[PDB]
């Protein structure tokens, strides 16, 4: 059968052991997340202008009752419920947030005439629907200036649903950010981009169904919201260790954090109304220092002494701190002991994950070594949600030691579709194979189970009775998952082995990404197997931003260098970067461009038609759970 | 048995498709190792000051005949030879190095009234006896000038061996490094430093017997030189993108390349020699990108990227290129050749892997997919004696994604000892496991056998004749092994499973590190059993260098915040930095310090005492090729 099962014993008595181990009596984040509500509009749907539908809640209502459910984590199921707590609301006199309009929260700080807001959510549809909520509670103000936190998609996404370039080029709107934003924007997405987009689907659960047996959550929020990414470059730069601004007769502390939670982030200290803004450096989780849709592992190190750094300026007078994600703390003491036990979070992972480390034990290891102490353990803002301690500290080891455990025997291995034949053969065949994993199962041992029947479903990936099974017991771990990637991947898997893989770009990301990247990208595009034996070199002059690269394809490698040119490459192009954008999304073509004065060349005229014939593209839908098709 | 055995019919068949595929018709390396020759002396033994030898070529003298032996790679024994190529040569003219007598090479560039030393190998005793060699052939000469190339301890490890601190005091010596250099210097060796000097062993093969069926070399040089580790900072810097500097008349170009081979590194161009020292970014093999010992991974595309610089400034015009590892090369159409294809390579690694990345391919098949095109393939330099192509396409992909290979079948893995007993009993049993490895042994099928019967090891690590099969295996693995670090890591894997592991600190590398790191190394050294339920803060001051600390020890973890007091710290102590360093060298007692007024404390005096209580040490031996003893 291919539809999900009931929870086992075995994922009973595990939801039953999570009750018992954490503190369920301690329901202050349910007064936490209602505290100061003004509006939870009575049934959430956001449409995109092509029509899609950008963000719902309605398929979360199973959640509203509060029961119970033992196909989900009870810690995870009361995260889930505390992050439908959802609206508009206060947080202090003159801050507000829109919660639960799209995975991230959007603020607004009452400025003497007009809002300052910090983020934007994904997506115009959901940042312009949590403005409009916020102008029909509390009266229709202009935005004077737009803050983001820090250079994730989830925060700079909707920005254009808030306000337009016009106003910028007016400068009737500010956009501060970060240094480095516009770096960082773009930049981790983009050369593994199709990879983590992909190994997405599984950590997001894309495919899977909202319900008890789907998704239910995704930690820092209900999910992510759908639509057009857009993005407008910041008009001013949080610099050095930050700035004290005011703006709009408020004053604003920035305390940037290069290299947590995001490459370019800042914290946001708020004097007046005592108001401390963790960025996403502090969430109601542990967060990511590697994620599993596939990224750079983070620094906890240095994720943990800029907490302790806010926590010494800040923390020592906050009355209220509050985030980017999740809802706001308030009391001092409260703050106090927040930002301690998530620096200590942070650094217990890293120092323990090395101490474990430096004693012997391996990346392969570490996870099932490491405990957070009682001290940590026992706060619900500490809880593996979104992070979890198993992932985050075989990515200390990771960042520190690599991939490798230091075992020769798995120094030089076989693909898994390449040794998986020999594994099944060495196990007795297919049929006794499932018949011990089976016994196996029935025993509950699915953590066993996952890793010994995938050995089958990559040797044989059309045996339905394998990839059932296997499907059954990833299926149990992730009713099990206290992690919501961790459950959406286990139930995402579970659905592609029951029903196979499906076999039915944004104008700002683009137009944010370096010249260098770019080339970078498409050099990573490039086909081996085009490019083999030939050379070619390209002047390539952009005017508009006064960028000169020089291009070399030579021994299967495209090159780029900023700045240089060549008396002798065989052709030189002239074209704005902007009409280079647009050439690449396919809004105009190459013969136009020339006609419009817009495309110039000298040298040979074939050789840049020549390298873009040399790239390749990527399918999207990959196989994962299987070797490939 | 317990002994090396004979190459396998399979592995002699791997030697003759080496010699097959490999142009072992190019010799010309060994016209360019020889080149400039000055004197080798005949039987080079260096000693160090306490009595141990550190370093000798003696037991190299198996490779002299240059007979093929098919315990060892064609390719790697025709490497073996050429790092044999040792002695004073000249390189152009006032322009020498001393090759061989440790790891790296150092170079003497003749200045008008003395040397301008780069690098200064390993320990001091060879730089000295290299130094003493140029003096007896070359004439005495003061060293004026020592430039550090980059970071890394086989460059600046030597330097006392060169110059004195008064010297350096009086500005007689002046110490040029990339900046960056203190920081790099000892930062990567610290926090995981036990895990990464073990896993070394098997890098470098350390408890190998030099012969064929033992360590024959370590690819960028034989091997590394044994000794007391030295370090003296800089006095001046190298900073932005490079300078022009003329040291005792000669002109020197120096070409920043951070985070290439090392985080602080840098070209050196010689405009009157028409000379381009390549640092470590070109040497004549493939280099790591992840180093196996366990370290961050690092960065192709930056790497191919200022090897592209380097020939677009300098190889346009270079006579001789050389570099701080093997021979040079000269003649200005092969320098440019090689430029190209070292900057192709790593692009090609890099570019490559995520193209196959972007397309599914994972962390666990990238390195049986990626291979090298022809004209990058088929060059001496680009083979991967020290990185490999199989290693470093997996450490780019491990950049870009990680660990985790998507599947969640492998998300949260049973530790290898914890599902070892399963494996074995689906396979039938140890014996019957046995049974069927020994029969797949017979069929050459060796990177499969170390696999599965690694299982039976972690399940039975007395079983002694898995242990013995196993090591056989791998044995055919190091033999078979081009890359040095890989045949020494199969050879010390094969040497620990017949054997067993082994059952019987540097002032300046010490007094080089960051306070901040120093503490960060404490906190990792913390027994978090000893810590728990614990709480105490105290103020670090450093009057010598003029730094104050909080330390806060809380919630099982200990933070370190430079440049911070608190009013409510427990206790104030005040040290200086060099009377830290004697103390935790245990050079001198903390009661002798306090005798001496040396290290102060005001409120409770026993806080620290207390902290250093908490911090426990870590076991070198630990077991790698079975689970802890
Ligand atoms: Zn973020
Ligand atoms: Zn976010
Ligand atoms: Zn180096
Ligand atoms: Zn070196």
């Known amino acids: 059968?291919?539809?999900?099962?009931?929870?086992?014993?075995?994922?009973?008595?595990?939801?039953?052991?999570?009750?018992?181990?954490?503190?369920?009596?301690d329901r202050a984040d349910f007064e936490r997340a209602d505290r100061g509500l003004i509006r939870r509009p009575e049934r959430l749907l956001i449409r995109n202008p092509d029509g899609s539908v950008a963000?719902?809640?309605?398929?979360?209502?199973?959640?509203?009752?509060?029961?119970?459910?033992?196909?989900?984590?009870?810690?995870?199921?009361?995260?889930?419920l505390l992050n439908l707590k959802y609206g508009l609301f206060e947080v202090a006199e003159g801050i507000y947030q829109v919660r639960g309009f799209d995975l991230?929260?959007?603020?607004?700080?009452?400025?003497?005439?007009?809002?300052?807001?910090?983020?934007?959510?994904?997506?115009?549809?959901?940042?312009?629907?949590?403005?409009?909520?916020?102008?029909?509670?509390?009266?229709?103000?202009?935005?004077?200036?737009?803050?983001?936190?820090?250079?994730?998609?989830?925060?700079?996404?909707?920005?254009?649903?808030?306000?337009?370039?016009?106003?910028?080029?007016?400068?009737?709107?500010?956009?501060?950010?970060?240094?480095?934003?516009?770096?960082?924007?773009?930049?981790?997405?983009?050369?593994?981009?199709?990879?983590?987009?992909?190994?997405?689907?599984y950590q997001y659960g894309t495919q899977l169904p909202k319900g008890p047996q789907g998704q239910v959550d995704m930690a820092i929020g209900k999910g992510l919201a759908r639509g057009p990414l857009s993005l407008l470059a910041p008009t001013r730069l949080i610099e050095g260790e930050g700035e004290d601004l005011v703006l709009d007769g408020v004053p604003f502390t920035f305390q940037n954090t290069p290299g947590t939670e995001s490459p370019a982030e800042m914290n946001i200290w708020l004097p007046r109304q005592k108001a401390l803004l963790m960025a996403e450096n502090v969430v109601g989780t542990?967060?990511?220092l590697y994620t599993l849709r596939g990224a750079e592992v983070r620094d906890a190190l240095g994720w943990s002494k800029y907490i302790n750094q806010?926590?010494?300026?800040?923390?020592?007078?906050?009355?209220?701190?509050?985030?980017?994600?999740?809802?706001?703390?308030?009391?001092?003491?409260?703050?106090?002991?927040?930002?301690?036990?998530q620096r200590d979070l942070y650094g217990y992972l890293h120092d323990q994950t090395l101490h474990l480390a430096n004693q012997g034990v391996t990346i392969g290891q570490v996870h099932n070594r490491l405990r957070l102490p009682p001290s940590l353990d026992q706060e619900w803002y500490d809880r593996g949600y979104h992070g979890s301690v198993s992932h985050n500290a075989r990515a200390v080891l990771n960042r520190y030691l690599g991939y490798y455990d230091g075992n020769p025997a798995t120094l030089d291995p076989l693909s898994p579709e390449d040794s998986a034949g020999r594994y099944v053969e060495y196990m007795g065949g297919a049929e006794r194979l499932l018949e011990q994993a089976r016994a196996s199962?029935?025993?509950?041992?699915?953590?066993?189970?996952?890793?010994?029947?995938?050995?089958?479903?990559?040797?044989?990936?059309?045996?339905?009775?394998?990839?059932?099974?296997?499907?059954?017991?990833?299926?149990?771990?992730?009713?099990?998952?206290?992690?919501?990637?961790?459950?959406?991947?286990?139930?995402?898997?579970?659905?592609?082995?029951?029903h196979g893989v499906p076999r039915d770009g944004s104008a700002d990301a683009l137009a944010a990404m370096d010249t260098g990247l770019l080339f970078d990208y498409l050099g990573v595009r490039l086909d081996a197997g085009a490019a083999e034996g030939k050379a070619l070199s390209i002047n390539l002059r952009l005017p508009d931003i006064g960028e000169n690269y020089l291009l070399e394809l030579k021994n299967?490698?495209?090159?780029?260098?900023?700045?240089?040119?060549?008396?002798?490459?065989?052709?030189?192009?002239?074209?704005?970067?902007?009409?280079?954008?647009?050439?690449?999304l396919?809004?105009?073509?190459?013969?136009?461009?020339?006609?419009?004065?817009?495309?110039?060349?000298?040298?040979?005229?074939?050789?840049?038609?020549?390298?873009?014939?040399?790239?390749?593209?990527?399918?999207?839908?990959?196989?994962?759970?299987?070797?490939?098709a």
Chains 1, 2 share one sequence.
């Open 1 to 25: 059968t291919t539809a999900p099962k009931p929870p086992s014993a075995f994922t009973v008595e595990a939801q039953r052991r999570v009750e018992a181990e954490l503190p369920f009596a």
């Open 55 to 80: 963000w719902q809640l309605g398929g979360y209502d199973f959640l509203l009752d509060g029961k119970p459910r033992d196909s989900i984590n009870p810690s995870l199921q009361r995260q889930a």
């Open 104 to 201: 991230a929260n959007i603020t607004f700080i009452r400025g003497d005439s007009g809002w300052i807001v910090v983020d934007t959510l994904t997506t115009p549809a959901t940042a312009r629907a949590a403005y409009e909520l916020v102008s029909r509670e509390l009266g229709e103000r202009p935005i004077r200036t737009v803050i983001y936190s820090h250079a994730h998609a989830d925060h700079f996404g909707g920005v254009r649903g808030l306000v337009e370039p016009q106003q910028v080029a007016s400068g009737a709107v500010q956009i501060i950010a970060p240094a480095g934003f516009m770096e960082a924007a773009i930049k981790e997405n983009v050369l593994a981009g199709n990879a983590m987009m992909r190994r997405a689907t």
């Open 286 to 288: 542990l967060h990511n």
């Open 310 to 341: 806010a926590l010494h300026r800040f923390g020592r007078q906050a009355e209220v701190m509050f985030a980017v994600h999740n809802w706001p703390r308030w009391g001092n003491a409260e703050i106090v002991e927040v930002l301690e036990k």
């Open 441 to 498: 199962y029935a025993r509950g041992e699915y953590r066993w189970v996952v890793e010994v029947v995938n050995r089958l479903v990559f040797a044989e990936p059309d045996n339905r009775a394998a990839r059932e099974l296997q499907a059954d017991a990833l299926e149990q771990l992730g009713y099990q998952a206290e992690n919501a990637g961790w459950r959406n991947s286990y139930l995402s898997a579970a659905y592609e082995l029951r």
């Open 556 to 584: 299967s490698h495209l090159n780029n260098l900023r700045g240089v040119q060549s008396e002798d490459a065989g052709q030189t192009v002239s074209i704005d970067r902007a009409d280079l954008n647009r050439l690449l």
């Open 586 to 628: 396919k809004e105009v073509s190459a013969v136009r461009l020339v006609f419009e004065g817009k495309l110039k060349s000298s040298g040979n005229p074939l050789l840049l038609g020549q390298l873009f014939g040399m790239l390749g593209d990527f399918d999207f839908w990959f196989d994962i759970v299987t070797p490939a």
